Design a protein around this ligand. Structure first.
Ligand code: HEM
Ligand code: HEM
Ligand SMILES: Oc1ccc(O)cc1
Ligand SMILES: Oc1ccc(O)cc1
Ligand SMILES: Oc1ccc(O)cc1
Ligand SMILES: Oc1ccc(O)cc1
Ligand SMILES: [Cl-]
Ligand SMILES: [Cl-]
Ligand SMILES: [Cl-]
Ligand SMILES: [Cl-]
Ligand SMILES: [Cl-]
Ligand SMILES: [Cl-]
Ligand code: NA
Ligand code: NA
Lengths: 480, 480, 480, 480
């Protein structure tokens, strides 16, 4: 049994009536409870994420099955049985908060690992590749996919114009327009690091690594017609599903695998191993099991924990480092940059974002300083032995630079179509039909020249792929 | 034929590639175009409206048919044929930005008139009454209706708990759970001022006024089943419809009517004429035609114009004033208050929000001062005749206060159930069945005590209304 | 012995060198430590207070000597010997952060009492009256006093134009241009509540109250010449003095007195007892001792505690209420309003601003939500007995309204000049000469018409006062 | 003759009285004019600059005397007689907005050139070198200099601790503790680019460049005692002086010179030519005259134009590029970064920050979008020939990279003391005495070990320099 109070701690006498001139008169300015209560209501909302605005979160645990110490010194991977707390957010990409979870889109798969050497964020998607290979293009890509800036409705003519003129998108689109473009929910879904990263071991040796999450629940996808039927009755079915699984004790889980590749394999491959439009052959670079993540606890407050959660690919830990991937390189900047705006300069103090590991440094102040700071010394070097100091046992590697000059230049061996053809051919006949069906419904109303260029990009990937699409769209491509 | 530039006006050499160490190396910090482009993309989003987040805008014109100078000195209403430019936003209420337009909700109907004596905002809804009668309850009402703060899903058990314990809601719920709770689109839809306002003529004489918008396209609604079938294929059908009507020249329009009531009618009535849970009888207070509003122009940019548009019931013009309605009194504060947070201290300089009438005053500075201010004099009184001065020809009326103490107290004659019964009985048999159907689908899963109290509130409105709902829900109300 | 870390908790290997292409090349974007550190440095600053920007804070304790339960139910005043923690900020008014503490100005004297029934802020100044009597004028007054908006330099011509046309300022200026317009420091300085407030006892009986703080160190002032000599060497001497006193154990203190006046004394006085340009006679309404406040602890961090401190006159507690004073009435709004902009929606969770008393309500979210909220119920009324509820034992009084219309109208008996004459005549001859000296150095350069009006205002206060000022300025007052 | 209005354009009836219950009653909430006016007053302030908060601005014109086309393609320098509008802000560094202009500090000298190929900012200081050579140290350096985070008072013990442990500071301190550490005002003052930059001509040939501004009014400095006497009577004398010069038609001016150095001179030198702790010999690299800048117009509004002005060393134009200077490299990021926070995402639309050159790109939205955007196409590549495209005639150079790994490593040939000795010996005997006097008054109270290390750093620069300082401080340095 508790009092309603103001934010000043004064108990509230009447939470029903405003203060007025008699029982039915106009309202007085001297009503601190009314003004405080409205003013805070008036300030509840903060900016949604610029992409991935729609999402849901859960906590759980990651457990190591096979220590990875031969390949990385990462502390959270050092020993069999080692357990690390995680927070995870899943999401769509393009549409705003409140938008349906039945739309075609990659799905976000962002994992925060609270390790003893700092927080490690692996900010993944379900699908293992991406549309583009340079971050400079990201606002363009996003602008083309987002609702039209005049009508506020997504328009295939706009994103197909971009994608067709950005032929490195061809492999991505060959995945996205399979039925795996609409996962059934967040649990029955793949996860992927997408980028090549660098793993560095106790001897300073480096390997390239890729990450894969495989669902215990299996993968399940929705046809366009199954997606429509769900959309009719529930625009939030994936959010609902994730919460409910966990509430009922049916905890979803994923096994983590890696692929590893020596740095020297660059010069022999017919693609760039740090091109995020590429996968690595599972025959040549087999999946190796690392451990299992199980999600087992819903957050206590959606806004405080899921909405305010902040992940960044640049939250790396010793033993794990960026690759040269130019898409990745831009992300290192963009996430903490956007988060300082979306959440405040001190967003890293918000509880879900805090490390378990100790934080000590000489940063200070900023909007909403809540942490009770003390001390006279906020600079280094200083004469005081007890104040925080650098620690040379934790230095990153020093990657070798193969280039001679500061350049703006596409990577060599872009190879935009080959893997797209390999993927196409790996599909079963039923999967190939769904792909063509999905592509056709998306392309049928797009401007003719762009329609043709899309067909030609897919034709370059595989002649049967492109021909089928052309036949299904009524386009005669015999002159070419 | 134009150059791409930076925001500093420097032409861009390469909008495709980041600046790197050779063609495949890591990225350099000295890439102003990359950082500027990403940093602005990272800051595109602002907070959505705390309610009515989903919506769509258009411009048009209002034309007077019958001059209203006998009852109000309002300049825009002074002459037959007088035309005033408007901007209008329509909206849903509860769910966020990308949410479907097929959900049950009141619809917002906000009209900004750009008059020669200032901007006049009539911030209406389709339905003519409201759930509550005091602004102190608005955050509670909203919190109950919004998605649950843990699960992020709306829960009828939550809002029914609030509404049943707020029996003044009974009239509103009787409208909202008719099929008018889901308008077919924004054109085929009623509009209402909801509140009683005061009209004051040039002699200082005051009348109570209510506003009504009647659609030229007629009113049309969706059953739950028709709403689902639309939802399956389009989660923005009403946004689409409004744009498309206007693009194809099929301009939607609404006629404006008023009702007028002498102040002295207060004692003649068994309810409070400034209680926004109440309508006025059209027999006793007939609709009088004022004019017609036609919407004929889509905005050029949805974010700059529709998203950033700011309406407030406190944007009143000479001749038009607030009533004592306690719900209204809170709104006078809340709208500019939230807008200063949502849009900035200087939101009134954003183009859609700017008046056509001249603005001159002594306010200054604030975030994003873009208006090229000049002059040494930013205070009044001052000794300079050419500086802006108050003008005593534009004073508001001085309403009489009947109460003699500052109190927090419910209005006399709340009369929470009578008009709800009158509405119920005014429904056709088919409308009554839809109401009971809609209510039953919403109530069938809520907690048993709350379910019973709902039935009792509707029973107090009308015995048949309540009995039908009880029978349909399998609740035995014979002991009461 | 501690590691320097990133905000993610990763130890820092090198806090001296940026990451670069060889030992002397350009810098890489993949340097999370560099970018995090700079980005947080780039965001250290928040807006300064719109007035009273320069100031200093300390903590201490207030101890009751005479219990006040006969006149107020205020819990912190209920018993002899009862101790309440305080936080206090002292300040100048007009110039920005960083400005000298040797300038002429009122001094702020803001006391936050952390009481068992909520925080009580008494937001005072040293001087016991104010320039103006209506909050609508405050931005005008402040704009006139502040540096000129073109030159960034304060201009006596500007504020004397305002003040002369605002003759209710005459009493204030007669205090401010004594040498008490430059206190020697914050310890040897008066405090005042300025406004009349209402004290309400357990029986519901109300008295008017005024507050006075009397320094144990005595009151001491600086002549213009003594101020200049200090200014030459120290532009923060008062901040320095306060800190150093407390560090050396020489704790400054003030005794609190009140005056009490029956409500019925309105009608027989020749001024309005709620006009903040007026004092109450100490002969007719004697000072009654309440207790002593001692300041004994410096804050641990100036930004987190003093810069972010938030006081409002509307932070009232049961037994202490606003008066009708129209200056006060505007302050009730303005302080929490500016603080939400200056500090954030959730400024009340910043540690110095937190109550000791429990806080429970249904407000939620907002920028920087750090309080780990939980629970499904964020609305009232609700069906749960354990959730926070209103408590009717804590209702404010219901002041009687004498007026019967909503009006914009000056108070009756403004009496602008009488107390200014009484003050003048209460000065010793030496104090009178300092006043005329101080006034003359301020007025000598202002425009001739405004100069004359100032003389006339002070002449209306007292003929000798005005004649002396005229003589000293070389102004011929014979025509008038 | 004009009306006072609200921001809605409604004329104001009464700018003197709040709306109240009778002439002496409490205030009503329905007073839009009061609430709008107070609310905007409450939001006037934005964050001050994190450094250089105190400053003053003026506009003028730069005129080329000698065309520089042989060394740079910069358009504003291409022809004799070519005139370019400038905006210039001068400043102190460490203390806040209202702080005195008589304090020891470098002075900022920031020039914005509104060129036909974009805005070019040359963000200089009076003194030609800096304390540090890597941006990673800047927040440390600044934290040490700034008022103590507990006391709010600057403490020489704190910055001398940092500086003595950062011996690269030794040259800077040898300038700063001459009397040129307190310029007499902003007109009689040097300007410097500080960094080496790269100039690139139309053939792609690169030279290193340094910039120097020489005042037509000559250089004048203040002794500590002269600075104290001015401080006593005016804490804004330099802001006053600049305005007054320009108001009286006495326009200050500076001639611009450069030094040029071939890239191949790197091996010829015993220091790194891109180390900002170093100058270049005027004998070996003579000053070459470019043109003259005259300041001739005060701004119209100090807040709108000076306070909201935004400069960045990264606002470069074709023909002018960064060097590899690691201090510079951090600055490229930090200025726009801080500005987005201080001013808003759209700060580049604030009138003073706008280019004269056309701006066309695909960025959109952000807080306070006032630019009336239109169009469906906000992405590139796109199929439309009329939309903005990259232009390959405006590419930056491609500087050669000498290093072959990503490293964190001090430059070779830091040479921390030699130029400090050369500067010392260049002083006249009177200048040497003022240096020692100034140093002694700053050092006499710092901790003994730090005091000794300072003496040793200056001794390493020049034995006489260090001996004199030691004698003056009573420190016996026999034993070293
Ligand atoms: C209508 C009249 C007045 C208005 C509109 C007004 C408004 C304000 C505002 C906006 C602030 C900044 C608050 C913050 O950012 O935390 C402030 C500070 C202050 N005001 Fe006033 N004020 C008024 C009259 C007075 C009076 C009469 C006094 C004393 C009796 C006073 C004493 C103070 C003090 C001491 C502070 C600084 C509190 C602190 O240390 O943070 N003001 N005022
Ligand atoms: C790594 C070294 C440095 C860093 C991180 C740094 C950072 C900053 C920042 C963040 C600002 C605020 C800018 C704004 O609010 O718009 C600033 C202002 C300034 N800095 Fe630096 N700075 C550095 C070195 C220098 C140098 C070498 C100079 C001169 C050569 C200098 C001169 C200035 C000036 C003049 C301003 C104020 C510009 C204005 O008037 O608006 N700084 N600095
Ligand atoms: O993110 C995407 C969603 C849907 C698409 O059709 C293409 C991209
Ligand atoms: O705004 C509302 C929407 C749906 C409801 O069932 C009740 C209120
Ligand atoms: O606050 C004030 C300072 C100086 C003045 O001359 C008047 C008021
Ligand atoms: O920036 C500075 C200010 C004061 C000092 O004594 C030294 C440097
Ligand atoms: Cl740090
Ligand atoms: Cl104004
Ligand atoms: Cl705000
Ligand atoms: Cl509440
Ligand atoms: Cl930001
Ligand atoms: Cl762009
Ligand atoms: Na007529
Ligand atoms: Na007692």
């Amino acid at each position: 049994h508790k009092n309603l109070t103001t934010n000043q701690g004064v108990p509230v006498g009447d939470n029903q009536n405003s203060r007025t001139a008699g029982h039915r008169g106009p309202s007085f300015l001297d009503d601190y409870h009314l003004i405080e209560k409205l003013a805070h209501f008036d300030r509840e909302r903060i900016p949604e994420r610029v992409v991935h605005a729609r999402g849901a979160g859960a906590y759980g645990v990651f457990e190591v099955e096979n220590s990875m110490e031969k390949h990385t010194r990462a502390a959270f991977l050092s020993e069999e049985g080692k357990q690390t707390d995680v927070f995870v957010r899943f999401s769509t990409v393009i549409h705003p908060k409140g938008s349906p979870e039945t739309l075609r889109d990659p799905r976000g798969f962002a994992v925060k690992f609270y390790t003893e050497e700092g927080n490690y964020d692996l900010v993944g998607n379900n699908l293992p590749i991406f549309f583009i290979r340079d971050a400079l293009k990201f606002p363009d890509m996003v602008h083309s996919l987002k609702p039209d800036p005049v009508t506020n409705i997504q328009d295939p003519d706009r994103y197909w114009d971009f994608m067709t003129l950005t032929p490195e998108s061809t492999h991505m689109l060959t995945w996205l327009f399979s039925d795996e473009g609409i996962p059934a929910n967040y649990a029955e879904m793949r996860g992927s690091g997408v980028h090549t990263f660098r793993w560095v071991n106790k001897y300073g040796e480096t390997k390239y690594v890729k990450y894969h999450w495989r669902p215990s629940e299996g993968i399940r996808n929705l046809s366009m017609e199954e997606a429509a039927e769900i959309q009719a009755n529930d625009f939030q079915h994936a959010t609902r599903d994730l919460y409910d699984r966990i509430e009922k004790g049916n905890y979803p889980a994923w096994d983590l695998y890696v692929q590893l590749m020596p740095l020297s394999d660059y010069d022999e491959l017919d693609y760039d191993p740090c091109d995020p439009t590429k996968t690595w052959s599972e025959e040549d670079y087999p999946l190796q099991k690392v451990g299992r993540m199980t999600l087992n606890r819903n957050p206590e407050n959606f806004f405080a924990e899921t909405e305010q959660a902040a992940f960044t690919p640049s939250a790396l830990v010793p033993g794990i480092e960026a690759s040269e991937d130019k898409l990745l390189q831009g992300r290192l900047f963009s996430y903490p940059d956007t988060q300082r705006h979306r959440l405040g300069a001190n967003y890293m103090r918000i509880p879900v974002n805090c490390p378990y590991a100790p934080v000590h440094n000489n940063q200070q102040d900023g909007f909403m300083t809540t942490t009770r700071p003390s001390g006279h010394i906020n600079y280094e070097p200083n004469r005081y032995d007890d104040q925080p100091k650098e620690n040379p046992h934790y230095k990153e590697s020093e990657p070798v630079l193969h280039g001679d000059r500061m350049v703006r230049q596409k990577i060599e061996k872009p190879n935009d179509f080959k893997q797209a053809g390999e993927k196409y051919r790996s599909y079963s006949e039923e999967e190939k039909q769904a792909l063509i069906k999905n592509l056709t419904a998306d392309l049928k109303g797009v401007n003719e020249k762009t329609k043709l260029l899309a067909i030609c990009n897919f034709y370059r990937a595989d002649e049967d792929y492109g021909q089928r699409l052309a036949d299904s769209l009524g386009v005669d491509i015999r002159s070419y």
